[PDB]
């Protein structure tokens, strides 16, 4: 930890370039998934050690679940194993999606119930099989009804991969959210591109 | 000198046309009077817009919040928006303001423009966020109905003043947009900074 005079209350990661990541290593694009496992973890640990309460995670959306087969199927691996890796350490989880589709993996339904693990030192939300028009439609006030209500409102949001954009993510939450964007592929995290988007955040 | 020949061009701009208060406060004036020096700026990305084919532009006014402004401010905002609309009204425009008119805050001088008016040629269609709320525009619809209904999909949104939030414009509009800031204060507006923003968009 750099010393800070404020931290967001509320970080998204949009975990984003795992494709390009693996395509420029000579991989096949599906391979990226699985390196975007130990960067989740690296930002997490951070989190806790200098105090960021509550962070949310992209994982992947409706439309994602489009893409062949065989990015489907390690995209969903390694939100999977990113959801069980989170769970050894103290984290209170709560992944949030469509669970009424074939694309929901199973292994993920425990977590629609935000669950404490070890000591619940920072509340982690996933976003996986994700809809914008689900969320907001889950509702027909209605806007504490959407289907993301029990994740609050994003002070900040980081996207990895250099494209400045939501793609979808929380239209409620980041309404006001301050935007840095990494370019750096997803799996090239270092802590410094975190201790970058908080010195943006507080000196705004 | 030149305009750039574009391989792809967006079909639906947003603008947020920050800095003219920080603009006036740096030339000394009073923070009201920095938003007379935008209609100028405003009236040539419009004639940038007519030259290079730009279909559509979408103008953040004032939001609801904002009218709780110093009162001398919010006249002056307020006097801004209603000449932007009457100026490019004289400019081949089809206009459209959308804002909550159920409102003593919603200026009755645009209640002419509150359904979409082609007005000479019809060479582009601009709209015009006055008295407007993401909260007003989503609950509107007690999502083919919110208040925003007719300003479509945004394609590319630019914001003018360093802040890298979306503010809340238009939250369904702009789910994907990309999202290019500008550094520099609106009234300081560069035809440069608008070929900067595509130059951005056609590159993702
Ligand atoms: C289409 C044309 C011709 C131009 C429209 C752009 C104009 C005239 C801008 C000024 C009016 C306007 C939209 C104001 C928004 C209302 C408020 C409260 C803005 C906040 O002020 P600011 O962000 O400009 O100032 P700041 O960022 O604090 O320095
Ligand atoms: C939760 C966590 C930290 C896990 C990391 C991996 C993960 C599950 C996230 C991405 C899912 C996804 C469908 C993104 C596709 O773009 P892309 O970013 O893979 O590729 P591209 O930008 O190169 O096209």
Redesign the pocket.
């Known amino acids: 930890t750099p010393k800070f005079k404020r931290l967001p209350g509320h970080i998204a990661?949009i975990?984003?370039?795992?494709?390009?990541?693996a395509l420029d290593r000579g991989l096949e694009k599906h391979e990226?998934?699985k390196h975007?496992?130990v960067?989740?973890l690296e930002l997490y640990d951070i989190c806790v050690k200098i105090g960021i309460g509550e962070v949310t995670?992209?994982?992947?959306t409706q439309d994602?679940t489009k893409?062949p087969q065989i990015?489907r199927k390690a995209?969903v691996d390694?939100?999977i194993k990113?959801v069980k890796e989170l769970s050894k350490h103290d984290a209170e989880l709560l992944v949030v999606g469509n669970t009424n589709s074939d694309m929901f993996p199973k292994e993920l339904l425990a977590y629609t119930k935000r669950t404490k693990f070890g000591k619940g030192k920072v509340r982690i939300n996933?976003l996986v099989n994700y809809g914008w028009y689900w969320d907001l439609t889950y509702a027909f006030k209605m806007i504490e009804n959407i289907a993301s209500a029990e994740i609050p409102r994003i002070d900040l949001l980081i996207r990895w991969?250099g494209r400045r954009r939501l793609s979808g993510m929380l239209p409620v939450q980041t309404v006001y959210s301050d935007i840095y964007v990494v370019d750096e592929?997803?799996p090239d995290f270092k802590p410094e591109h975190l201790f970058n988007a908080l010195e943006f955040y507080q000196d705004q």
Request: include cysteine; charge should be positive; charged fraction near 15%.
């Open positions: 990661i975990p984003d370039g795992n494709r390009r990541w990226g998934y975007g496992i960067p989740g995670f992209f994982g992947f994602n893409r990015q995209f390694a939100c990113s996933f991969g592929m997803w």
